[model samples]
Target chain A: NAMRTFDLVTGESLFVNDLRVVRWEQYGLGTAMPFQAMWYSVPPGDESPIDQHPELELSIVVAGTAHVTVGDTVHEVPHGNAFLLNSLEAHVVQNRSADEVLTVFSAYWYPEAATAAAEALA
Target chain B: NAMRTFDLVTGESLFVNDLRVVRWEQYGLGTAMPFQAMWYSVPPGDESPIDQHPELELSIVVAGTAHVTVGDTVHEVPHGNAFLLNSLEAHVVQNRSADEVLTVFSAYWYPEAATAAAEALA
Candidate 1:
């Protein structure tokens, strides 16, 4: 709809429980860097590996709370919290709460590509 | 930063109710789609349009509360809330709280682009 707006009356759906992955890819070689973002609903005892990527990652907590670690240091990023990861740094994300879904939102970009150098929204 | 891990001990900084905008562009193809995102710093009375975008827009609310509207529908996206926009939709976002900075992060993409057709992160 031109000039038409669609409201998400569905409410808080993007960061629910289920774990899902979304990939953005270019056509081919020398093309734009392809990256993926994920939504995870980790059980109380579940934890995500401290994996690293060639690109910078922006992670936001959507549903519950997460005991987040980057390198050896740990920080608590609760719902409504957002952070940035640069380079292939060792990082870990753990679901600290059992009942609440540890919903998260992430966006990935190539650090050397020049676009991300502009910085993320505050 | 290369291979370096930096931790953000500054808790809940992204969504502390301050708004900022970042822009992304192609070096110059028809030139790739370039879009801008803005952050808002307001008191109790503040609102954003249900404005339509010719391209797809994704928005995440980081702090406080907002009354979001798309078309005729109204949704309450609290902290850790995210939503998407397709086409030019009439939408409105209002800051419903005082004493909080309405932090938001947004990414924009072209609709007909072959890349976006890749079906983003699930």
Candidate 2:
């Protein structure tokens, strides 16, 4: 499979492939972050279409580099750098190096105040 | 410059000797995670001193692998995997491979509720 999805709330492997999409819920006891984290990889010569999620999301580039288009701006995100995709913001991520693998760890959450502020800005 | 410290809140260059320690205040609009992020790198033979922070911290191994000792339990954390150090939990991170560069993205934040819960457990 070229792409797959996983459920952070359910303790089951929703789908699996070599594309490197794995999501896990924060296991810190008594925590209340609604945190969902995932490792996402985009291989060389591949790109993702514009996408949106209802929760506020942030990601850090782990390996290689990626051209991240958030809203109407583009950023050259390199390894160890982090970027945010605000609540429901449309964005695209593409591998910057043709021969390298791009990996990112993305974290998302739905906080009422955060979503409200994002909606106001939008 | 093998070891250095950085300020997460002060928008100034604290120190500039690159053993790969870069910390930034999360810039997500209206976001509130106390949200400090940093990229940490440990080379072949070096290991950080067992330490504890007042706030909780979570980190993901980005490249190579790391041996994470949290409190009394030890875990082998590999690339694309995350581990947490609950509030004030003493932990140590060491490079697992002798010839590899271990890189990790660490995020830290302090929440009143979280600290209270951790204190109860402690």
Candidate 3:
């Protein structure tokens, strides 16, 4: 395929639960990469579901602070900061600000791929 | 196995050619994810070597601007913008500003994983 650019700020948005999400799957259909890339806009005083999956996740805070709780630890992640969640780890993201919307970019991939990559690096 | 956070601004830095690179492999060793995550600080007026590989890449501009050449197109990607490069597509990233340093976060994954994910999503 060819090189493609995406603007998260102006991308089409969809409401997933209480957060506005931008899914880039449509734009990435032609690529071979299996990872899913998405952006989530969290409204102030809102939080995501305590969820767990077989896919590992990497989340980067882009706009505001994120009170990210992974298992028992709560990480205060600000802009330019990132957090990683291993497969099957229960996690939630909260936007504690009264007015500001928290935005984050996240990528998810299956455990099979993760394990292979880690072993190859080792 | 556990949640971990990373900071790009103060992470251990290594010089790769004209860019300051931060490899997060050590911190990610415990995780199952096979993908490699890295941060690149491109100096002003500097450009990377035109390169291609079997791994697909996702590059997000976190600071300053990037003049990215993918195949034959030149994209002016500013902060919060991202570009995708397919496996084996020749590409390079350049910092055109005279004073600013361009910072980008990138993830690389094998094409086999990408193909599997794309088919699964399809």
Chain A TM per candidate, in order of listing:
0.65, 0.69, 0.86
Q: What is the C-alpha lDDT profile of model 2 across A1-122, one tens digit per residue?
A: 11112222232333333355655642323453224567777878777767787666668777788787776677787776667665677888888686998877786655453333233334
Q: What is the lDDT of residue A47 in candidate 3?
A: 95
Worst ten-residue run, lDDT, model 2 chain B? B1-10
lDDT string, candidate 1, A1-122, tens digits: 22222222322233224333332222121212123444445567567755777756766665578777876677787765556676677787788786776666676655433232222211
Residue A22, candidate 1: C-alpha displacement in angstroms: 6.5
lDDT winner between candidates 1 and 2: 2
TM-score of candidate 2 relative to the true fold: 0.68
Give the worst 10-residue stretch by lDDT in candidate 1 chain B.
B25-34
DockQ of each: 0.15, 0.14, 0.52
User: Best to worst by DockQ, what's the order?
Assistant: 3, 1, 2
Instruction: Tell me candidate 1's interface RMSD.
Output: 8.5
lDDT of 1 at B75: 71
Q: Which residue runs does candidate 1 get wrong by more than 4 Å?
A: A1-36, A112-122, B1-46, B49-56, B61-81, B86-90, B94-104, B108-122
Better of 1 and 2 by TM-score: 2
lDDT of 3 by residue, A7-106 (tens): 9788888886889888987574554555678888899999997889988888888778999888788889887788888789999999999998888889
TM-scores, each model vs. reference: 0.53, 0.68, 0.84
